[PDB]
């Protein structure tokens with residue numbers, strides 16, 4: 001019958017002042033026969049009620065997808081609180097309890113390195129600027145590129161990868177026109193991770 | 209009832225001489241009531257019979273997982289042949305036909321760049337060597353590191369990422385002891401992709 005999924009808040013929401021992080025409970029596969037759903041949000045076993053149950057949009061396979069949203073505390077998430085969402089629907093012989101929390105296991109500070117474009121790329125219209133971030137745990141992270149205190153459009157970041165030591169790494173590639181690089185502009189890789197000081201660090205990258 | 213999945217061959221198998229690439233049909237969720245499964249392998253509609261149906265290992269949720277394996281031609285896969293695997297089981301009102309093939313869409317040759325370690329890492333026991341591969345389509349690829357004609361252990365590669373242009377990129381990080389790099393050894397990033405000459409290319413990386 002019904003299958004339930006459960007989602008962590010975004011890394012940036014748990015790390016930066018005054019954002020509103022959110023655990024999300026998504027129930028999928030309820031028919032027209034038993035579509036009346038109901039949630040119960042518990043924070044470390046203790047029941048709480050500041051939840052947001054979105055009304056039930058239909059589907060493209062004739063089921064219903066109900067989404068409840070539970071605002072959490074940035075610090076409640078960082079201190080390892082469990083968030084179990086209890087689901088009710090007659091199509092189930094018994095309610096579904098799915099629980100979620102931050103990755104357990106020793107945290108490790110990311111190491112942030114910048115890499116200038118390989119001398120071979122320097123004959124294309126655009127060039128690639130590279131951020132290596134490595135050594136971090138848990139894998140929850142946010143990486144961003146800017147320049148002169150303003151963000152960047154044309155960058156892409158790889159998912160976190162398990163490294164040989166059991167920590168994570170990733171790369172961010174920032175693509176800019178060759179000229180902007182030749183001209184000597186300054187670009188920054190901003191990283192957000194819990195094991196950083198103030199959850200934030202920044203390494204620059206420019207010509208030499 | 210039964211849900212069926214379908215898997216492409218490994219990128220290296222379709223690109224290098226004399227390997228044996230394989231499409232794999234994995235049926236999941238069959239009970240003890242209707243566990244008698246049956247396959248039918250078609251190559252571009254035309255039925256074929258050089259298939260390998262593994263006998264049905266049980267599970268940890270009391271279902272059966274049946275796996276048939278179909279050897280394909282390296283060139284039949286590169287020329288866009290469709291491989292539909294037809295599945296039969298009484299728990300289904302009708303057989304399940306899942307079809308699979310190489311990514312359609314114009315292929316693009318990867319551009320392979322090597323990046324030496326950031327001058328900041330040069331105070332750790334080990335250093336990171338970096339291979340950027342970019343501009344390729346379809347995302348099916350194989351990247352490997354070696355040194356003096358022999359492979360490397362301690363390297364990790366990111367999944368292919370969709371770039372802003374609709375092509376893919378990735379990075380491969382090779383971790384070596386600092387000394388091995390200081391000493392001036394030569395390391396190579398080998399790339400395999402269909403849009404390369406002979407499906408293979410290699411860029412080196414050493415000290416200056």
Ligand SMILES: *[C@@H]1O[C@H](CO[C@@H]2O[C@@H](C)[C@@H](O)[C@@H](O)[C@@H]2O)[C@@H](O[C@@H]2O[C@H](CO)[C@@H](O[C@@H]3O[C@H](CO[C@H]4O[C@H](CO)[C@@H](O)[C@H](O)[C@@H]4O[C@@H]4O[C@H](CO)[C@@H](O)[C@H](O)[C@H]4NC(C)=O)[C@@H](O)[C@H](O[C@H]4O[C@H](CO)[C@@H](O)[C@H](O)[C@@H]4O[C@@H]4O[C@H](CO)[C@@H](O)[C@H](O)[C@H]4NC(C)=O)[C@@H]3O)[C@H](O)[C@H]2NC(C)=O)[C@H](O)[C@H]1NC(C)=O
Nearest residue numbers: 003005007008023024025026028029059060061062063065
């Ligand atoms: C009827 O249709 C619906 C709708 O889906 C689609 O809708 C139509 C329009 C088409 O597009 C169709 O393609 C399709 O029908 C179907 O509902 C789907 O049901 C499947 C389950 O079979 C669910 O798959 C799961 O996906 C989650 C992750 O999903 C996130 O990312 C998806 C994209 O990759 C995205 O589609 C989802 O919306 C969701 O997106 C996130 O949403 C939140 C919202 O708050 C957001 O904050 C996030 O940022 C956002 N992320 C983004 C943007 O992508 C995945 O985790 C599940 O994988 C686990 O479970 C699988 C078992 O089903 C198992 O195979 C995997 O290996 C994996 O295993 C898990 O492993 C972890 C540890 O790593 C463990 O903790 C877990 O317990 C374990 N799971 C197990 C085994 O229990 C899973 O693959 C889809 O979410 C869902 N689609 C949507 C959009 O809701 C439905 O199937 C159709 N009916 C039928 C035919 O049956």
Ligand SMILES: *[C@@H]1O[C@H](CO[C@@H]2O[C@@H](C)[C@@H](O)[C@@H](O)[C@@H]2O)[C@@H](O[C@@H]2O[C@H](CO)[C@@H](O[C@@H]3O[C@H](CO[C@H]4O[C@H](CO)[C@@H](O)[C@H](O)[C@@H]4O[C@@H]4O[C@H](CO)[C@@H](O)[C@H](O)[C@H]4NC(C)=O)[C@@H](O)[C@H](O[C@H]4O[C@H](CO)[C@@H](O)[C@H](O)[C@@H]4O[C@@H]4O[C@H](CO)[C@@H](O)[C@H](O)[C@H]4NC(C)=O)[C@@H]3O)[C@H](O)[C@H]2NC(C)=O)[C@H](O)[C@H]1NC(C)=O
Nearest residue numbers: 211212213215216232234236237267268269270271273306
């Ligand atoms: C009973 O148990 C079985 C076995 O699970 C095991 O035991 C249970 C108890 C749990 O503890 C599990 O955690 C444990 O693993 C369960 O069977 C599972 O069923 C789910 C579906 O609900 C399947 O999930 C799918 O996973 C595929 C890819 O799976 C590969 O990689 C997995 C790890 O990443 C690995 O677990 C799989 O074995 C498989 O491994 C591959 O194997 C081949 C063999 O040749 C090998 O070559 C590969 O190298 C290897 N790969 C890796 C990485 O190791 C995933 O693609 C599926 O996602 C699609 O479907 C989802 C719906 O569930 C949906 O959410 C996704 O969006 C996605 O939808 C697809 O989207 C694509 C485009 O992106 C589109 O083209 C497709 O059409 C569309 N799919 C369709 C058809 O709609 C999916 O998540 C697991 O394969 C399967 N587990 C195993 C081990 O087979 C079962 O759930 C249990 N019973 C129940 C119901 O409770």
